[PDB]
Amino acid sequence: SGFRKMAFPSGKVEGCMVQVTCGTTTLNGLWLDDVVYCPRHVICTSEDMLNPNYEDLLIRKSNHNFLVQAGNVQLRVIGHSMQNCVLKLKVDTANPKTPKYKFVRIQPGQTFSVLACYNGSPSGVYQCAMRPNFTIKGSFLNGSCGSVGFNIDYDCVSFCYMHHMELPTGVHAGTDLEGNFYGPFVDRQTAQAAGTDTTITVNVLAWLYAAVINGDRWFLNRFTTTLNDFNLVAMKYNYEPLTQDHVDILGPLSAQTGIAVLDMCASLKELLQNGMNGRTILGSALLEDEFTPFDVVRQCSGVT
Amino acid sequence: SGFRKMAFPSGKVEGCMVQVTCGTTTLNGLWLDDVVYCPRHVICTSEDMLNPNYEDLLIRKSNHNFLVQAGNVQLRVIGHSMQNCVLKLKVDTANPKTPKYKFVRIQPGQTFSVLACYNGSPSGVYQCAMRPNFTIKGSFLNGSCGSVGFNIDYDCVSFCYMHHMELPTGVHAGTDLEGNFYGPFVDRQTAQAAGTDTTITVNVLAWLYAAVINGDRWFLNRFTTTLNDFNLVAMKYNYEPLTQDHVDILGPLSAQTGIAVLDMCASLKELLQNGMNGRTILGSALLEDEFTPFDVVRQCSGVT
């Protein structure tokens, strides 16, 4: 028992982290096979970021201007192309540490692990989620750009995120591994409003199921609710609407605990209307939404 | 910016994880050089755990009874010995993935990353701390025994913990890599009272410094305090006493923010006496104590 904000083992991803330098800008790159993926803003100076024409700035760059260093050894750039907001640097050597991989674009509410890197070197690993407003509440400093977000299914690493920027509000924005930004964000230094940060309702419910599985049962009440009634309360508290798909997704946790999904909803409704009253759930004083139902089942069953 | 419960990259430790089977018991082992370290209770059945005589149970075991599997390949056991509550299985092959390593016994208040494993396979990685009562609030299931807690300083992995058991209260107990249990715990299935779980005061202060560095400043007040006055309040709230050593340890964070340690103490004193009032600090509704001053400086500076 015990419930932790658990990240995937980062080893498979550490072996892909490289350093990319273009001009005076140094950031991180992901080396899978003979291609190095990195944020296209590697070609910019901090002054270029105000109003960049990436296609124009790119014409002034050749293969020999992109310095790729894997560990302490230089890689040879034999090609370069821009795909949306990422650069694909073709190197002459396939990464001998390349895991089985997929590039997946995740939806808001989905969680993933981030391996924060500086100069191609992994600094740390933490678990976070794509917010309903397409930002991530990460921990990134200058030089972390090109750090990736990922999931693992046994041996296959599914890359879902690459870090690009910190919005003025301290939140983070990035792309999927095809260069497409999550949400309406652009790689331009202009104030971009993040949007309403709603709570991922299905994930809070999953986390209430994890709490019951792990012994924390104080919040369990004698009430039930309907999806329509619950959603009225959820709207009021800036919680995402709960759908019948979310109810089905919570089926396996509902079976394991014997608590019907709408009974757990009524419990959640009371926690929103009454508060925690100085109490905790899984050592937390707030309702946690960065654990999906798949994450709870995974952590509670011991998937490796 | 952004502050996350960040774990060390787990790659160096994943390459040391092996599966140890003795009789019908299967748990994890740490393979460094030609030695596999594992909990001595690998020789027990769940019935033996009630009243085990490890030295007696051990006489009935030979090298060929300890099945060590690294990935999908078996390792040859050429020796075995018991050191306190750990078994050292001498194998005929040195781990080719052995990192630079140290075995260190940590003090309460210190944090480390745990790589939760099942059958020698890493399942996840999370950051936790040795509590003042020598337990860890981990996330372990049956079969996780032998999972290790560690720190990294560039390339040297300092192993500090090996998981042994879950106390009836859902908390965890284990040893250092020399087989010595943290605290008064014994590898025997008898109810063991964990002891008072106090808050690591120096770590809460470090985390308040991280919040100021990351923009959360609402809790900053116009007051100061003395160590003696602060400790009166800290005692009342089951917080560890703050020493002059802790004040010195918070020096670099006090310099970086311009907030004197006793001014931050007065801020902490008010948070304890008044509560958060429905507000958050670094996205948390409670005072976080599982980040040391070294962890804050590390995460805020970008150590790789």
Ligand SMILES: CN(C)c1ccc(N(Cc2cccc(Cl)c2)C(=O)Cn2nnc3ccccc32)cc1
């Ligand atoms: C390449 N170049 C010199 C450069 C320089 C600065 C940036 N920016 C500013 C910026 C640009 C574009 C858009 C928006 Cl909203 C902000 C970042 O936000 C980069 N960044 N990412 N995570 C960070 C955490 C802390 C500090 C900086 C961080 C990008 C590129």
Ligand SMILES: CN(C)c1ccc(N(Cc2cccc(Cl)c2)C(=O)Cn2nnc3ccccc32)cc1
């Ligand atoms: C080898 N053998 C068959 C065996 C079987 C059971 C255990 N015990 C019981 C136990 C023994 C000793 C002391 C105390 Cl307080 C409890 C554990 O606590 C083992 N364990 N570790 N983390 C866990 C999380 C969930 C479930 C079990 C977990 C140890 C050894």
